[PDB]
Design a binder for this molecule. Structure first.
Ligand SMILES: [Ca+2]
Lengths: 80, 105, 100, 99, 100, 103, 99, 80
């Protein structure tokens, strides 16, 4: 469908709050969706690359952990 | 027969570590002292995180370590925070830290 | 019960537990927390090993010895962490050699 | 009179609340659909381990939380309290993510 | 005195010259510049081979084949650069397999 | 020669010898070193082409670090490939922020 | 008729000049003695290949130039044209050099 | 006195010129010296480690190159 809107305003505000943000421009929310999307495209492309190299039709968490390590964004706790 | 771990006075599996080294494409050959040295280092580091992660639990009035407890422990220690600066601990959350200028007067 | 054993999956968790009971005997550890301790041990294994692999390779040597591990450790860990980790690795080698 | 907090006071509460907590702050389903949607551009009819989507979410939110820290510093640096697109953009330019 | 000390420090520089002469016959290259080209080739050698090593190791495979080199190249290079690198790699393995 | 059969200037046997000896795997495919070499050559070819054009633009018959730096940093993709690399005696691209200029 | 350039004009000429050139901008000897001075604090009676000290300089100069570019944006971001210590500090904070 | 002062105000001004800076606070010259010393500290520490590991009393260029690669600042042209 068209799911990027499903990253709602309030959910963006929540993340920003955890990030210590007090006041938030009206323009931030679309700007953040762009960044989040860019972030996902890159991580997933490498994940999928790993999946395809393994001749599988199902992305594993390792595919994603390995992709994340490739982006200098190591993740612990999903078999890493 | 007693394990190489027991000879070295360790909890971590010196035999396992030595095999991982042989099977991980690091060198053609592996010294006997290497896996002993390594195992010990991994155990030390492990002990240093568990000491600090236990303290965060006890301070939360909890018996069992969770991801938060590890995170708190790690980021509140300058050295560990450096070691794991580019590492994300899932279900860790962040240290409470509100910038002073954002606070009321 | 049911047939076919689930296929083996190595972990460090029994050793994390053992170290846990030395350091904090009255303290346990959650499922995901252990996944983290595992991901940690594996991270630092990889880092240390890789650097030792390189050290050996730069100085034209086929063999990773306890010497390489020490040097890698000095390169990788911060100050106090390296000292202790160097002490314990030395202790462990010393102790192992004399128990042959 | 009906009670009212002044602008800034609930914002600070929300901070204290979410910094205390560790739960994921994006709604799991809309995220999962987004993961599947992006993944189609590269390869169609793809399955996902559930843990792979959780991993992907854990990673997204840690990235973005972190990015908001840097962003909040860039707004503060220009004597502002409000984050703006140019704050995010500068942060990212310095991190090296963007040219 | 002959003073035999041909230390024989290897380099890609002869092949860089050979490719330079193909893409620009009437230009050359300083010693430092040639050093940068040598660093470059080695840098990218390591990145691909190291990424190729991981593929094989992740998939429990003892053999780095040209498939592992291709996936590595897709991962490591940006969009257009990858496409052509894949093309030239594919073409090369084709042409090699036809000859003897 | 292997490099000759593959259509390549870069040494196929050298690459194959470096793969075995570089602790990458137990075993190395015979397709591998052809492919890696060909790529290594292709990339080398792309930079020299552009740096050569940078030398041609400065009335020099010889490529110097600057010419490589100018080739790599004005091309989007190479710049990204070597983002975390410093090129010795390379210098920087002429670039002054707009607000710093006069009116 | 004594000639005078306005504040900023020569700076602008210097930028243009230095961007065009590639030659190292720290005097080599004071640099070499600083490398030797700091090297003592790890090991005494250390010898340096000349190329080793040159690598270190090429390295030091690229990193600092780069940091100045990032610092310069931090100044501009705060509606200034003058770089200041806090600009360097934000930059290195965002780069992940300091905490 | 300090070799750090051998990195003069005019050398610092040149570096910041190459990095496109037009106007420079007086304070920067010390601040810069701080950063630069920490930079060298970190790179030299790791280089000398490679030297001490090679059983030499002479730091080669390669020692620096490996130290600069480890620190994420890969360097071309010096025996890479
Ligand atoms: Ca061409």
């Amino acid at each position: 469908r068209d799911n990027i809107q499903g990253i709602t305003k309030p959910a963006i505000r929540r993340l920003a709050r955890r990030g210590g943000v007090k006041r938030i421009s009206g323009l931030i929310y679309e700007e953040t969706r762009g960044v989040l999307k860019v972030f996902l495209e890159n991580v997933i492309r490498d994940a999928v690359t790993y999946t395809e190299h393994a001749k599988r039709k199902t992305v594993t968490a390792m595919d994603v952990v390995y992709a994340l390590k490739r982006q200098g964004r190591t993740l612990y706790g999903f078999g890493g | 027969a007693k394990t190489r771990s027991s000879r070295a006075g360790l909890q971590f599996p010196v035999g396992r570590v030595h095999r991982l080294l042989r099977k991980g494409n690091y060198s053609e050959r592996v010294g006997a002292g290497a896996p002993v040295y390594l195992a010990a280092v991994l155990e030390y580091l492990t002990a240093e995180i568990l000491e600090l992660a236990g303290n965060a639990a006890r301070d939360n009035k909890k018996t069992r370590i969770i991801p938060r407890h590890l995170q708190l422990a790690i980021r509140n220690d300058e050295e560990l925070n450096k070691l794991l600066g580019r590492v994300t601990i899932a279900q860790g959350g962040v240290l409470p830290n509100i910038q002073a200028v954002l606070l009321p007067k | 019960g049911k047939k076919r054993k689930r296929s083996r999956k190595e972990s460090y968790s029994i050793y994390v537990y053992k170290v846990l009971k030395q350091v904090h005997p009255d303290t346990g550890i959650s499922s995901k927390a252990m996944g983290i301790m595992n991901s940690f041990v594996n991270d630092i294994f990889e880092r240390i090993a890789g650097e030792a692999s390189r050290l050996a390779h730069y100085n034209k040597r086929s063999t990773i010895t306890s010497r390489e591990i020490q040097t890698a450790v000095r390169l990788l860990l911060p100050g106090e962490l390296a000292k202790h980790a160097v002490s314990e690795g030395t202790k462990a080698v010393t102790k192992y050699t004399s128990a042959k | 009179k009906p009670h009212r907090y002044r602008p800034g006071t609930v914002a600070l509460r929300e901070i204290r609340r979410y910094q205390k907590s560790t739960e994921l702050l994006i709604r799991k389903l809309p995220f999962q659909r987004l993961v599947r949607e992006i993944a189609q551009d590269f390869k169609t009819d793809l399955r996902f381990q559930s843990s792979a989507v959780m991993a992907l979410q854990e990673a997204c939110e840690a990235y973005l939380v972190g990015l908001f820290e840097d962003t909040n510093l860039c707004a503060i640096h220009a004597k502002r309290v409000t984050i703006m697109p140019k704050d995010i953009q500068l942060a990212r330019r310095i991190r090296g993510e963007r040219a």
